[PDB]
C-alpha cells in the first residue's frame, strides 16, 4: 500500500512508481538510477533543460527517450517504463518533479525526516547538536525515522527561535511573544 499519498498529481506518478518498485523491492536501486539519469539530464544543459519542455512529436519524444537510455545502461525497468509513460503523456517537465517526489517517497521508506529550526540569525553548532539530540530524545523523532535540522535565516520572526518538525512546532520567537504582549495590552 502507498507510503502515504504525496500530492494528487505528479505524486500520483511517483506513488505508482514507488509502490510498483516497492513490490519489486528495488527502490534504492531505482532511486539511485533515477538520480543518475536526472544528473545526466541536468548535465545535458542545452536540450536537457531545453527539451524538458514539449515542442516536438510523440515519435521524436520517444527518440529523445531512446537517447536518454543510451546515455547509461541500467535504469531499472520500472523507471524505463516510467520514461515511456512520460513520453506518452508528453510531459518531461514534471520529470524532475517526479524525481523529487520519488525522493520524498524514498526517504520516507528510509524514514529520514527533514526539520528546521527557523531563526532570524545563524545559530550556534552547540544549539544544532543539542536540539538534534533533544528531538531524538523525544518521541518527536520516531527512531527508525531519522532527522535533518536546518536553520534558515528569516528576519520575519524577529529574533528568538522556532523549532519545527513533523506537525509539531514550538514557537518561542520574540516577534510572536511580542504579538501576544502587544495584543493583550491593546486591551
Amino acid at each position: 500500500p502507498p507510503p502515504v499519498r504525496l500530492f494528487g498529481v505528479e505524486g500520483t506518478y511517483a506513488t505508482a512508481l514507488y509502490q510498483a518498485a516497492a513490490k519489486n523491492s528495488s527502490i534504492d536501486a531505482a532511486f539511485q538510477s533515477l538520480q543518475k539519469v536526472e544528473s545526466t539530464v541536468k548535465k545535458n544543459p542545452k536540450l536537457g533543460h531545453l527539451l524538458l519542455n514539449p515542442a516536438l512529436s510523440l515519435k521524436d519524444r520517444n527518440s529523445v527517450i531512446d537517447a536518454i537510455v543510451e546515455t547509461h545502461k541500467n535504469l531499472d525497468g520500472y523507471v524505463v517504463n516510467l520514461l515511456k509513460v512520460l513520453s506518452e503523456n508528453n510531459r518531461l517537465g514534471c520529470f524532475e518533479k517526479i524525481a523529487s517526489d520519488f525522493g520524498v517517497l524514498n526517504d520516507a521508506h528510509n524514514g529520514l525526516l527533514k526539520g528546521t529550526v527557523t531563526s532570524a540569525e545563524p545559530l550556534d553548532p552547540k544549539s544544532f547538536k543539542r536540539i538534534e539530540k533533544a528531538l531524538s530524545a523525544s518521541k518527536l523523532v520516531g527512531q527508525g525515522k531519522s532527522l535533518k535540522l536546518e536553520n534558515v535565516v528569516k528576519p520575519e520572526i524577529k529574533g528568538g527561535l522556532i523549532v519545527e518538525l513533523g506537525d509539531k512546532t514550538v514557537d518561542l520567537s520574540i516577534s510572536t511573544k511580542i504579538q501576544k504582549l502587544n495584543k493583550v495590552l491593546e486591551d
Partner: protein
C-alpha cells in the same frame, strides 16, 4: 489605577507550551487561504494564522485545507505558519452581553469594557426537537395596532418582516423593541423579553444612529446588539447570525423569554454567496450556493417555545428580508417564506399613500398563532379583518368609473376610517389596553360618520378622554385581558359619549 490595570494585563501574559499542528500558507488572497498541513483538524475549527488573523476552516481537502480568514489579507503573507486554535467556533455567552454592543467575535465595539460571560457556546447548534416544545400560549404584542390585531405575534414563532429596503425597514422592528420596554419596566422574568438586535451588513453610521436611538429612548439596558458592519469580512458576516443565535440560546436555556431580530437576513445570504464563490463551491441559483436554504433553515429553527419541562424558554425570532425590486420570487425570499411561520409584507406604495405603518395587510398573514394575541383584542378585531377585507373588495370595484350604490359606500366609508385609525408615527408604540378602545369604536362604526380629516384628532382626544374618566376601565383591560359584559357596556357607553365631543 490605569497603571494597575495595565500591570494586570501584562501580568496576564505568561508562558506557553508546544503547539500542535502547523501548516504553511501557499496560495492565499481574497480572504481565503489554503494551507498545506493540518492533518489533524476538526471541521469548522478556528485556526490562528501567524499574521494574527484567526480563520474558520470550511474546506478540508486531501490537498490544501481552506481556511477562511476573519482578518485582512494584508496581514497574511506566503508560507506563514498557522497553528490550530483547537476550538470549533465558539462565542462567549452570558448576562453581561445585556447592555452591550458586541462584534461577531463578541468583543465590545462600543467598548464598555470586556464582556461578563457566564459560558462559551458553539456557533452551530442544532434546533430543539419535537420533544422539547410547548405550543405558543404567551403573546408578545409589538404595540403597533395593525400588527397586534392583524398579524398577532407570539413568543417562539418566527415571523418574517419582508419588504423594500430601508423604507424604515429597521424602524418597524425597532418599534417592537420599544414596546418591549413596557414589560421590561415591569416584573416577572417570563413576562419579560430580553431583546437581541442583530445588524448584519449595515453601515457603521446607521448602526451608530441605531444604538444612539436605543439609548435615546432609554431602551438600552436590556438589549444585546450584535453587529457586523458593512466593511467587516464576508466570513464574519456569514458567521454573524449563528453567533447571535448562541447568545440567544443562553436566554433560551435559562428559561428566559427573549426575541431576536435578524436584520437583514438577506445580507447573510450575500455573505454566504461570497464565501462559497471564493471557496469555489459550484454556485447555486442566482449564484447563491444551494445550501443557502439549509443555512437559513437551520438558523431559524433554533428559536422556539420550549416544553414546560424544558422551562418554556421562548426565543422568538423576527427575520427581516430586504426585497430587491419588491419581487419575492427571488430565490432567497422564496426560501425564507417557506421557513418562516408568518409573513409581514410591507409595501412601498402604501408608504407613499401615507399609510405609515405601510404594512400591506392583504399580503400579511400569521399562519399560526391566535392565542398569540389578547382575548379582548381578538374579540374586537374579529370583524376588523372582515371589514377591511370588504373595504379592499369594494375599493377595487370602485375603480374604472363604476357608480357605487349606497350600500357599497357604507362599507367604503367605514373602511376609510379604519385605515386612518391604523396609522402610527415612527417610534410611537402604544399600550394594548388603549388599543382595544380604538378598535371598538371603529368596528362599532362610531367613527364612520366622523370626518376623515379629524380622525387623528379623535384618536388623540379619545385616548385623553379615556385617560380622564375611564381610567378604571383601562386598568380592568390590563387586569383581565378579555372584555367582560361590564367592560363591553362601559366601553360602548364611553365611545358613544365621545362621538360628539
Amino acid at each position: 489605577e490605569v497603571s494597575s490595570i495595565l500591570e494586570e494585563r501584562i501580568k496576564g501574559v505568561s508562558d506557553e507550551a508546544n503547539l500542535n499542528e502547523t501548516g504553511r500558507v501557499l496560495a492565499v488572497g481574497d480572504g481565503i487561504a489554503r494551507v498545506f498541513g493540518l492533518n489533524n483538524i476538526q471541521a469548522e475549527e478556528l485556526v490562528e494564522f501567524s499574521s494574527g488573523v484567526k480563520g474558520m476552516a470550511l474546506n478540508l481537502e486531501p490537498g490544501q485545507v481552506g481556511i477562511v480568514l476573519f482578518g485582512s489579507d494584508r496581514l497574511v503573507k506566503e508560507g506563514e505558519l498557522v497553528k490550530r486554535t483547537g476550538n470549533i467556533v465558539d462565542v462567549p455567552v452570558g448576562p453581561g452581553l445585556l447592555g452591550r454592543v458586541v462584534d461577531a467575535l463578541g468583543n465590545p465595539i462600543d467598548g464598555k469594557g470586556p464582556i461578563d460571560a457566564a459560558g462559551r457556546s458553539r456557533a452551530q447548534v442544532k434546533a430543539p426537537g419535537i420533544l422539547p416544545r410547548r405550543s405558543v400560549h404567551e403573546p408578545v404584542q409589538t404595540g403597533l395596532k395593525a400588527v397586534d390585531a392583524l398579524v398577532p405575534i407570539g413568543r417562539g414563532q418566527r415571523e418574517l418582516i419582508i419588504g423594500d429596503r430601508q423604507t424604515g425597514k429597521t424602524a418597524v422592528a425597532l418599534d417592537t423593541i420599544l414596546n418591549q420596554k413596557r414589560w421590561n419596566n415591569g416584573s416577572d422574568e417570563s413576562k419579560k423579553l430580553y431583546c437581541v438586535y442583530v445588524a448584519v451588513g449595515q453601515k457603521r453610521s446607521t448602526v451608530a444612529q441605531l444604538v444612539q436611538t436605543l439609548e435615546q429612548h432609554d431602551a438600552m439596558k436590556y438589549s444585546i446588539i450584535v453587529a457586523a458592519t458593512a466593511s467587516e469580512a464576508a466570513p464574519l458576516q456569514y458567521l454573524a447570525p449563528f453567533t447571535a443565535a448562541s447568545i440567544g440560546e443562553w436566554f433560551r436555556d435559562n428559561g428566559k423569554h427573549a426575541l431576536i431580530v435578524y436584520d437583514d437576513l438577506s445580507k447573510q445570504a450575500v455573505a454566504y454567496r461570497q464565501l462559497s464563490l471564493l471557496l469555489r463551491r459550484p454556485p447555486g441559483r442566482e449564484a447563491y450556493p444551494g445550501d443557502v436554504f439549509y443555512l437559513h433553515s437551520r438558523l431559524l429553527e433554533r428559536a422556539a417555545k420550549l416544553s414546560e419541562k424544558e422551562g418554556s424558554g421562548s426565543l422568538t425570532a423576527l427575520p427581516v428580508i430586504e426585497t430587491q425590486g419588491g419581487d419575492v420570487s427571488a430565490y432567497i425570499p422564496t426560501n425564507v417564506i417557506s421557513i418562516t411561520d408568518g409573513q409581514i409584507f410591507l409595501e412601498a406604495e402604501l408608504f407613499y399613500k401615507g399609510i405609515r405603518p405601510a404594512i400591506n395587510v392583504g399580503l400579511s398573514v400569521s399562519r399560526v398563532g391566535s392565542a398569540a394575541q389578547v382575548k379582548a383584542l381578538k374579540q374586537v378585531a374579529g370583524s376588523l379583518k372582515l371589514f377591511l377585507a370588504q373595504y379592499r373588495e369594494v375599493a377595487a370595484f370602485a375603480q374604472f368609473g363604476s357608480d357605487l350604490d349606497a350600500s357599497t359606500k357604507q362599507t367604503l366609508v367605514r373602511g376609510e376610517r379604519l385605515t386612518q385609525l391604523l396609522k402610527q408615527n415612527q417610534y410611537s408604540p402604544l399600550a394594548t389596553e388603549e388599543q382595544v378602545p380604538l378598535i371598538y369604536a371603529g368596528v362599532n362604526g362610531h367613527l364612520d360618520g366622523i370626518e376623515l380629516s379629524r380622525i387623528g384628532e379623535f384618536e388623540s382626544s379619545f385616548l385623553s378622554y379615556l385617560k380622564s374618566n375611564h381610567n378604571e376601565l383601562l386598568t380592568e383591560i390590563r387586569e383581565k385581558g378579555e372584555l367582560s359584559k361590564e367592560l363591553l357596556a362601559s366601553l360602548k357607553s364611553a365611545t358613544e359619549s365621545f362621538v360628539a365631543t
